[PDB]
Design a protein around this ligand. Structure first.
Ligand SMILES: CC(=O)N[C@@H]1[C@@H](O[C@@H]2O[C@H](CO)[C@H](O)[C@H](O)[C@H]2O)[C@@H](O)[C@@H](CO)O[C@H]1O
Ligand SMILES: [Ca+2]
Ligand SMILES: [Ca+2]
Length: 582
């Protein structure tokens, strides 16, 4: 196929694209033929290019497995990624309509979008910087702090509830058919000043969503919509930084087809066929950095077996507070968690890091790193949480079930490591190493529900043998413990007749508490091995009453144990906590 070229300083729209010598000036000419691309076609923007009050929309087209369509950059990276900056002009705006009720949320209206991919399959977007900046909204995360008075620091927000929604990248399936093999690589999406409140408009750094193509008006429409489903397959977002956005950081899969998925909640478990038909399959979220979202960092919605891995979340829920979240209406949502799933089936979050989820002190009713929310089979394993304002993990309400949370490290997470408010049964916390300071404890004050702790290292990182509340409530069999190491505590649970008490954390681990306090400047995950390994602190020491003292464990939700936090194999007698020792 063909390849067109663009340069904001050269080009001249009266050119021809096709060759690097002869490019276009603006994206006007690219909008014009986007919809006629094109398996093996490509469009490329020269590093250093700055396209203001501009946008790229692209509708109803495809490559194929042989050859994707490709949107990207060309020649001498050390120039600046090419910047697309819509500034939410009229031309970026389109009319979003789920064409179905999807909860107490705005589900229809005008949305500004810098890069829209509306039913485009077999495409790959690359090495692009994307803004959707209001000049009249300024509140950067790098400099953010809590103030007695709103906007008293040279910052300014539009707290209007009817503020227009804005996306960096929106991905939209509304033809009653699969959108597939879409790929976002690199991308620096930042300063996307959307609506502070709206959870399910295309409002945030990157949002992928599905709509009914028609509103469901009759028996005959219902017959049709059951079998013709807008949905995603083989979506992959990776190596990207989403920073300073409102509201969501990265969201994929919210679908009008939840009117089918959530038809029979009861018991809480999610049928495979149902999620595969109506939901979104082969979703990968990979090696990204989310910093300073207004709300949640990363979320997978209505996804069949997604893979969320090697991502870094940092300092989100920036606008989830009483100063900024002033006009919630009847919608609520003054509430956010870090990296989590919503009505997914057997997802896997792994090798991720989550720092400093904000404002649980200032009106964020959540504030956790992780949230096994409604849905089934959630898997968190090999994740590090640090310094979050309210817990490492929540397991949320009646229809959150069958969670496994394992070989993870919580460090200085605050107001309790484990939040269990009325969650459903089947959850298994095991083999995690939790460092619990004087701002925290093991369980949140509001916990009252099921979990089964086994093979964990619970560490009292205060200056006194603590008498802890290990049990609040008895909903779905309350919290039961067996085979856990308790360090520097004055007690244990009345329900762990196989306890392993220890007295000093220095005789148990190499250097507890010394894991990182902030994401790396880059946004990358921390090294776990080699010169720069930043988790060595949590390796047991020669002679730890933690070596070989875990019982072999029958993961309640049929998940095969495989390796520890650091990834070395776990065979034989499992070493207590999340690390094994060479
Ligand atoms: C059960 C519950 O209320 N859970 C909260 C989550 O809320 C749901 O979020 C989904 C998002 O797809 C949708 O908006 C639904 O209508 C909401 O109830 C969510 O807010 C989560 C993260 O902060 O917290 C839970 O308390
Ligand atoms: Ca701005
Ligand atoms: Ca402020």
């Amino acid at each position: 196929g063909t390849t067109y070229y663009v340069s904001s300083a050269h080009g001249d729209d009266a050119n021809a694209g096709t060759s690097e010598n002869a490019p276009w000036k603006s994206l006007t000419k690219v909008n014009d033929i986007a919809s006629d691309l094109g398996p093996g076609d490509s469009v490329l923007l020269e590093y250093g290019s700055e396209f203001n009050d501009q946008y790229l929309h692209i509708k109803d087209t495809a490559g194929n497995a042989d050859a994707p369509i490709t949107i990207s950059a060309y020649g001498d990276a050390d120039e600046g990624k090419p910047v697309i900056a819509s500034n939410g002009v009229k031309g970026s705006q389109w009319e979003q309509d789920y064409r179905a009720n999807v909860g107490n949320h705005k589900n229809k209206g005008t949305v500004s979008t810098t890069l829209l991919l509306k039913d485009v399959s077999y495409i790959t977007v690359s090495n692009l910087e994307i803004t959707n900046d209001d000049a009249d909204v300024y509140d950067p995360i790098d400099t953010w702090k809590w103030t007695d008075t709103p906007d008293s620091d040279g910052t300014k927000l539009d707290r209007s509830a009817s503020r227009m929604d804005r996306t960096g990248v929106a991905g939209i399936a509304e033809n009653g058919a699969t959108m597939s093999n879409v790929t976002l690589d690199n991308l620096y999406i930042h300063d996307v000043d959307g609506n502070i409140y709206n959870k399910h408009m295309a409002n945030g750094g990157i949002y992928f969503m599905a709509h009914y193509p028609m509103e469901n008006t009759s028996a005959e429409t219902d017959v049709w919509l059951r079998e013709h489903v807008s949905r995603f397959d083989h979506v992959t977002i990776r190596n990207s930084t989403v920073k300073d956005v409102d509201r969501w950081g990265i969201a994929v899969g919210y679908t009008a087809y939840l009117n089918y998925i959530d038809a029979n909640y009861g018991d809480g478990s999610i049928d495979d066929a149902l999620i595969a038909k109506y939901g979104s399959t082969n979703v990968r979220i990979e090696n990204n950095y989310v910093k300073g979202a207004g709300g949640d960092a990363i979320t997978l919605m209505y996804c069949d077996r997604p893979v969320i891995e090697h991502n870094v979340g940092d300092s989100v829920s920036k606008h989830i507070n009483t100063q900024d979240y002033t006009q919630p209406g009847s919608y609520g949502g003054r509430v956010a968690a870090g990296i989590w799933p919503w009505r997914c089936k057997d997802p896997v979050f792994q090798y991720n890091e989550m720092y400093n989820n904000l404002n649980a002190e200032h009106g964020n009713g959540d504030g956790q790193a992780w949230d096994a929310d409604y849905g089934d089979g959630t898997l968190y394993q090999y994740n590090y949480s640090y310094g979050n304002s309210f817990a490492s993990l929540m397991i949320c309400n009646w229809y959150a079930v069958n969670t496994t949370f394992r070989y993870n490290i919580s460090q200085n997470d605050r107001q309790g490591v484990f939040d269990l408010p009325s969650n459903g049964p089947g959850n298994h916390i095991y083999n995690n190493t939790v460092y619990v300071d004087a701002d925290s404890q093991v369980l949140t004050k509001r916990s009252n529900s099921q979990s089964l702790f086994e093979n964990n290292i619970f560490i009292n990182a205060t200056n006194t043998k603590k008498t802890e509340t290990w049990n609040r409530g008895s909903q779905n069999g309350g919290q039961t413990y067996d085979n856990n190491m308790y360090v520097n505590y004055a007690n244990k649970p009345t329900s762990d007749a196989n306890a392993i008490e220890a007295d000093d954390v220095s005789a148990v681990l190499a250097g507890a508490g010394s894991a990182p306090t902030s994401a790396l400047k880059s946004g990358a995950e921390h090294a776990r091995t080699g010169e720069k390994a930043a988790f060595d602190g949590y390796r047991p020491v020669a002679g730890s009453k933690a070596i070989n003292a875990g019982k072999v464990v029958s993961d309640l939700n049929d998940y095969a144990v495989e390796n520890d936090f650091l990834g070395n194999a776990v065979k034989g007698r499992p070493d207590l906590g999340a690390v094994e020792a060479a």
